[PDB]
Amino acid sequence: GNFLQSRP
Amino acid sequence: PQITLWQRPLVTIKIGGQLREALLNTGADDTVLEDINLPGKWKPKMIGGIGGFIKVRQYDQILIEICGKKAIGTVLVGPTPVNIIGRNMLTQLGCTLNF
Amino acid sequence: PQITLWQRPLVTIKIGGQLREALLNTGADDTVLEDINLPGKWKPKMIGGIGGFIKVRQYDQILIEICGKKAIGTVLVGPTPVNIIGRNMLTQLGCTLNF
């Protein structure tokens, strides 16, 4: 339940 | 509203006539939803997180109503375990972190 | 401090003598760091997110210092793309979402 989100 | 972080920061969103719940996510650049069906044209884009990368559908200029306050912007549609409201929408809600 | 969200919310943290940067992540249940090294025993544990699961090390009762405010608790160590301060630590910094 750890929703990091980046766009690379 | 102010909100503590003792429970997951879930909010009610209305997007394209559909009611969903999503996590207010300061750890996310973008807004991502799974259980949703938006109409029209989109460009593929790849986004990544803690466990790697997913391909999603990039919809532009979408209207969301999040806690009954409105924003427009990029919404992404794809296999994300939980719907997330990212910073592109959060800055529109004048949303801040306070400690 | 109050923080806006036009920039990724990165803070400087001191953990085990090591200085690092980490994202304040309301969309995270736990605290996860990559480039750190902790002493002592740990339990194996698995967490997930966008893209599925990473296998991590669970260290208990770890002191962390963020913005020079102290907190103690579970810190996870594993292959996360960027360092993340999760809600188990943020509640302790009395950190709130305002919108």
Automatic annotation (TrEMBL), chains B, C:
The chain holds residues 484 to 582 of 1430 of the full protein. Residues 20-89 form the Peptidase A2 domain. It is found in: Host cell membrane; Host endosome, Host multivesicular body; Virion membrane; Virion. This is Gag polyprotein.
